[model samples]
Target: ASSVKQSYSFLVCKSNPLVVQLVYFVIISFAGFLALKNLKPQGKPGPKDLDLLFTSVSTLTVSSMATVEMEDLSDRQLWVLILLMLMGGEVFTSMLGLYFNNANLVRIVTGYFVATVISSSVIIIIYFWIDSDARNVLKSKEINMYTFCIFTAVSSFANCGFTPLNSNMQPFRKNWVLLLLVIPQILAGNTLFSPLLRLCVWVLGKVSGKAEYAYILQHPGETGYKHLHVRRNSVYIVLSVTGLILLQVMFICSFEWNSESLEGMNWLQKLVGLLFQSVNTRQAGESILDISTLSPSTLLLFAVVMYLPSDASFLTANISRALWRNFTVNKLSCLAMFTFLACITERKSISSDPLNFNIFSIVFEIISAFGNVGYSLGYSCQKLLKPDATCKDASYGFVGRWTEEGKLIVILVMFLGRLKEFILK
Candidate 1:
C-alpha cells in the first residue's frame, strides 16, 4: 500500500478563509495549551485525550456535536465516539463552569467565542490554502476534503444550514452523521455542564461506596459523556429540529412545488423545503432546499422562530449567580423552563424607523445572522442604490433585507457563534 494518502488540488489564496483559519489554529493551539494549564490544576492528569480532541473540534467548529456516528460503528469506533463525546462533555463542562455563571451568558458569550474562532480560523486556512494550490482530499474535485470538513465544522459547529460542496449534504446520508451532529447541539443547548456534572456525579457516587445502581449515571465516563452531552445539546435540538419539522409539515401542507417549475422531482422535494428550513434554523450551514421562491409570510415566520435561542447549563455559573446565588434543585426546573421557553417563545419584529426599530426584527436578524444561518424571506442586492431622503430607513431595511448588509450580518453571526465559546474560558 502507498504511504501517501490521495489529495485534491485547490488554489490557496492569502486572503482566503483558509489562511485566517490557519492563524487561528496557531493561536488556538497556543491558547488551548494555556487554557489547558489553567483548567487543570497541577498533579491532575490532563483531561482525557478524547475530551481534548473533542474540545478542539467543538472549539474549531463551535458546534456541540461529536463527529462520530452512533449506529453501525465498530467496537473500536464506538470507543472513539465514547472518547470524543466524553471529551466534549468535560471540556465544555469545565469551560462553562469556569467561564460564566449565567446560562444565558454561556449561550451568548461562549457560543459567540466558538463561532468567532471557527470563522476566523476557517478564513485564514481558506485564504492561504486556496492561493498555494493545496492537495485535495477527494480523488477528483476542485474542493478539498478539508473544505468539506471545514464546511461541516462551520456548519455543524455554528449550527447553520448553508453548505459548500454538495455531495454528502443529503437529507438521509446516514444515521451516524445525523446523530453525531444533532445530538451534540441538543446537549449544548440543554445544559453546558453535563459532562463535568456526570463525572462529578459518578465519582461522588463511587466515593460514597454506593452500589452501581445508586449512581445517577452507570455507564463508563467515556460512553456516558455522549448521553450526558446529548442531554444538554438536546434542548437546542428539540427547539431546532422539532420546530423545523412542525414548520415543514405546515409548509408541505401550504406550499406549491411540483416537478414542473424546478427539475425532476419526487415526494422528497415536497418535504425538502420545510426540512431545510428546520435544519437551517437549528444552525447547520447546509442548504438542501431551494429558497429563492418561498412566500414572504413564510419567510417572516422563519424570522420569528430564528430569534428564540435556548439557555442551558453550559453557563451554569453565570446563570446561577444571576438567577440564584447558587444552584438549587428547587431552581433547576424553573431555570430550565425559563431557558426553554425563552428559546421557544421569544418573539421579535424589526422596523425601519430607528426611533421605532422593531426589537423583534433587530433581535431576530441579529440572532439569525450571528447563528450563521441563511434562511431568509427575501433580500435585495445592495449594489444598485440611489440616495433618498429616507436612506436611513433604507439602511435599516437593508440590515436584514439587503444582500450586502444581510451577508455582513451573517458573517458577524458566524463570528459570534465561535466567540461565544470564549465564555467557557
Candidate 2:
C-alpha cells in the first residue's frame, strides 16, 4: 500500500478534487480487498461476497453498520478497521492539503490532529477513573484500559460505532459521566469539527477585543474563508442536533415510559439512556439501549434521524448554500415519494404487512444511507438478551434481512449519501 501510494504521489500534487476523490475511491477499494481477505468470521455460516464488500464500504464511509461482529476480528484486522475509520473520518483531506503545501489547509489540518490528541487524552483519563465491572471484563477480553480508551475515543470522535466490546455501551447505561464525555466527541466528529471550532474562534475574538476581531469571522481571512459559512453551518448543526435530541428524548420516554426497557432504571439512567439515543443518531452509532427493543414510533423517529444527510454542509460552501435554499422541500419530497414508491413496488412475503414493513425499512435505509450512518435493522451474529433473559435475534430489523434487490437499494443510498452534493446537483 505504501509503495503504491508513493508511486502515485504525483496524483496528490495535481490537487484536483476529482483526482482526490478518485484516490479515496481507489484506497477504499484496496482496503475492501484487504478486509475481504482478513475479516474472516467465526462459526457456521459465513458472509456472502457482497456482504464483505458492504462492510468495507461501511468502514471507509465511516458508517458503523456491520454484517460481521466487530469483536470477532483479529488484532491485525481490527487495526486495519481502525486505520480505515481514522482515514475516512478526518485524516485524509488534511494529508492531501499537507502534501500540496497549502498553508491554511495545513494549519487547519494540523489543528485537527492536535484537537484529537488533546480530546482523546482527556477522555482516556476520565474513562480510566470510572469504576465499573465492565472495565475488568474488558481487560479479561484483552482490551486493556489503553486499548479501550483508544477504541472508544476513535469510535466516538470518528462518529463510527464499531465496537470491539461485546455490548456497545449497554454495560455502561447508567454511567452518565461517560455518556456526557461521549456527547462532545460525537459533536466534534461532525464535519471534522471545523464549524464548531470556527464558532469558538468567533466567540473568543468577541471576548478578547469585542469589536476588532468580531468582524474577523464575518469575513474570511485565511482559514475563515475555507470555512466560509462557518457561522451559519455551526449554528445550524447545534440547533439541528439539539432539536433532534430533544425530540428523540421525548419520543423515547413517551413510548418506553412503562416498558421493560426502561423499567429497571432510575431517573438518571433513564435520562442518560434517552440522551444517548438522541445523540447517537448523529452518526456516532454508539448505543446504550437495544435498538431492536424500541417501539415502532421510536424506531421510525430514529430512522428519520439516520436518513439525514451526513455532511453538515455540502462538500463546498456554494453547494451547501444552494442546498440550504431548498433543503426542506427537497428532502421531505424525496423521502415521502420514495417511501410510497418503495412500499408499492418492493416484493415481500404475503404473510407480512407490506405497507408497514416497506415504509419502515425504506425510510430507515434511506436515512442510514444518506447519513452514511451504519445503523440498520439487519441481523448478524449478535443476539439480544431480553429482560427475561431469553435470547432473541439481534437485527437492525429492516435492511439486514432485505432481499438482494433491497440490499442494492441500500447500496445505492449509501453511495449517494457519500456523494450527496453531486446527487443533489
Candidate 3:
C-alpha cells in the first residue's frame, strides 16, 4: 500500500530488509507470472493473465487465495508455483532480508528451513508410498511422487496453503497420521514459529555450549533476530497460540460438532480434524471441511483467529500498550473499510446472486485474503434462490467468481496483508 505513492528509497532498498524482500518479491513474482502463462499446456478455457498474476502473487505472499484451480495447472506449472511459493513464503523472504542483517543468521535460517523441508518431504513421500488411497490418487493425477512431496512441504512450511489437488485436503480428511505430521509444520511455519525458533536456538545453545548462540539468544534485538523471541515472550507466544487454538477447538466442537462439516468423521478423526482446522485458522488456509457449509458462529470464530497477527502475543505489558497509544485504526477499522469497499464493488452481483454474494461470505473471504489465510466460502449453486441450470460450482475461491476489478482489489489486499507488520511501525 505504501508503494501507492512514489517512494524512491524502496528502489534503493537501503536499510529496510522488508523493502529488499518485497522488491525482490515484485520482480520474482512478475517473472513467475510470465513463466506461468508461458507454461500453460493445451487446456479447455485457458486462464486469464489477471488470474495468473493473482495466483502468482498469492503463491509468493503465501496467500492461498486463488482465482484459479490447482487441478487445472499442469505439473510444469505446479513447479513454477513451487518456486514462487518458496520465494514468497516468509521462509525465503526471511532469509532474503537476512543477508542484509547478518550473514551468519542468514546461513542459520537457510539451514533450518532446508532441513525442515527435506525431512518433511521425506516423511510425506514415504506416507504417499505406503498409503493406498493417497498413492492411488497420486498415480491417477499423474503427479510425480517427489514433486508432490516437495511441493507439499514448501506449501505447508511457507503457510501458502496451495495443494496440488483441487479437493484441497478434503480427500485426505480421514488421514489422521498425515494430519498429525502437517499440524506441526503449520504451527512451525506460522503462529508457533517464534517460540519454536527461540526454543530451537536455546537447545542449540545448550547442546553446543556456544557463546555465539548464547549471545544471539541474550541479544536477539541487537542481532536483528526479529522472530527469535526472548524466553519470557516466547513462552507467552506459545501460550497464546495454544490457548487461542483451544478456545477455537472448544467452539467448533460445541457449534459444528453435529454439522455437515464434521459428518463422516468418527470421534478420533473428528478430534484430529478439529485440531487441524484450528491450527490452520491463523494463516495456513488448509481446509478439511467445507467452510461454506459451517454455521456463522464457527466461521466468526475462525475469522477472529485469521485476523490476528502471526506473532500475536497474549502479553499485556506496558511496552505493548504503549504501542497502542500510538496505534491508529488497527485491524478492526482496516477490516471494516475493506469490507465496505468490497460490498460496493460487488453491489450489483449481490442483487443478482444473493446466495453467493451474502455480506457474511464476502466479509469472510475478505478477511481470509487480508490475513493471507486463503479460506473461501465458495459459490454453491444449492444455496441459490432460483436454481439456474447454468450454475456450476468451481473449486477455486469465491474471488474466482468475482469481476476482474474485484479480483484486482483482493490482489492489493493480499499484498497489504503481507505488510501488516509495517502498520505498527
Q: In candidate 2, list every pair of residues with a backbone clash.
A: 65-374, 306-367, 307-367, 376-396, 377-396, 377-397, 377-398, 378-396, 378-397, 378-400
Q: Tell me the tens digit of each residue's lDDT in model 2 across 250-343.
A: 8888888677766678888788878877888767778777666677888877876776554444435238986877775465666665555455
* Candidate 3 colliding pairs: 60-88
Name the regions of candidate 1 deviating beyond 4 angstroms: 1-141, 145-154, 157-162, 166-214, 217-244, 256-263, 311-365, 372-425
TM-score for all models, in order of appearance: 0.39, 0.76, 0.91
Best by lDDT: 3
Q: Residue 116 of model 2: what lDDT?
A: 72
* Best-first order by TM-score: 3, 2, 1
Global lDDT of each candidate: 0.38, 0.63, 0.81
List all candidate RMSDs to the true structure. 17.1, 5.9, 4.5
True-vs-predicted CA distance for residue 369, candidate 1, Å? 2.3
Tell me the RMSD of model 3 versus the true structure: 4.5
Clash tally, candidates in order: 96, 10, 1
TM-score computed on alpha carbons, candidate 1: 0.39
